[PDB]
Design a protein around this ligand. Structure first.
Ligand SMILES: Cc1c(CP(=O)(O)O)c2ccc(Br)cc2n(CC2CCCC2)c1=O
Length: 269
């Protein structure tokens, strides 16, 4: 149930056309069958950390009654670039739950930084990931500095394999209480930024929740998802890219193509 070889040559050709590195890990939750390609290499998380951030908030909500309903007020100086929800509520504030939804479904930067502050910063989110058994994940910096994607720099990285393992634990396993688990799924399902990535490889009659990341440099962008094919167990998968030159462009088409190859490798029609 390493189907990694059905699709190892097509992944290598896709990566050669792209001109960089592609990292994939895909898990069939029914059989436990996996597809790996550069699955243990580090890639920059970019915005993809915001899904784990929302899950860490949900975990804390199990301990702290009322956390999700707490109003948060912020100044103009909190509004960093790409804050499309939080800029509309500057004069009013938003709840923790609303910031978490904005962080997940619009990749809202100001919302992500405000929730990082609630958790004790990048070290607090790293702490939550260690708490679910993820020893690979590290967040080191805040938005926007975490997007530097410097070749060889382990800061603000994880592996495709650790991202998939943690995503399965949070969405399908026992890392969150059932209500919090379904809220995390529902936030991922409502994501607006991923239509050209994993979703572009998934039939319209299958449910999917995803979180994107785009660093803006070094051909670096990513997506992770849970996919619910009809008539079989869910699939969890992560697709990360980087490239050697700062002005290399990312490709959403390459992420969708990689997701297609992972699903073909798992035998999902
Ligand atoms: C938050 C954010 C996103 C959405 P996501 O990261 O989830 O895919 C985004 C998406 C595409 C591009 Br092209 C630039 C982006 N930027 C700007 C880049 C990262 C920092 C400056 C350049 C976003 O901030």
């Amino acid at each position: 149930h390493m189907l990694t070889n059905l699709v190892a040559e097509p992944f290598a050709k896709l990566e050669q056309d792209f001109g960089g590195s592609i990292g994939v890990y895909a898990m069939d939750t029914g059989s436990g069958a996996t597809v790996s390609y550069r699955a243990e290499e580090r890639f920059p998380l970019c915005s993809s950390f915001k899904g784990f951030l929302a899950a860490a908030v949900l975990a804390r909500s199990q301990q702290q009654a009322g956390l999700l309903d707490t109003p948060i007020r912020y100044g103009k100086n909190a509004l960093v670039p790409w804050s499309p929800i939080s800029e509309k509520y500057l004069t009013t504030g938003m709840t923790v739950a609303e910031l978490s939804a904005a962080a997940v479904q619009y990749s809202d930067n100001a919302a992500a930084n405000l929730l990082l502050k609630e958790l004790g910063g990048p070290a607090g989110l790293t702490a939550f990931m260690r708490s679910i058994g993820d020893t690979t994940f590290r967040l080191d910096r805040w938005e926007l500095e975490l997007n530097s994607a410097i070749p060889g720099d382990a800061r603000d990285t994880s592996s495709p394999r650790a991202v998939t393992e943690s995503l399965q634990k949070l969405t399908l396993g026992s890392a969150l209480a059932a209500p919090q688990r379904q809220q995390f799924v529902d936030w991922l399902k409502g994501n607006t930024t991923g239509n050209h990535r994993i979703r572009a490889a998934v039939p319209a009659d299958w449910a999917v929740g995803d979180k994107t990341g785009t660093c803006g440099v070094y051909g670096t962008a990513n997506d992770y998802a849970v996919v619910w094919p009809t008539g079989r167990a869910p699939i969890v998968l992560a697709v990360y890219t980087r490239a050697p030159n700062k002005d290399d462009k990312h490709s959403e088409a390459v992420i969708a193509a990689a997701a297609r190859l992972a699903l073909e490798g798992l035998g999902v029609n």
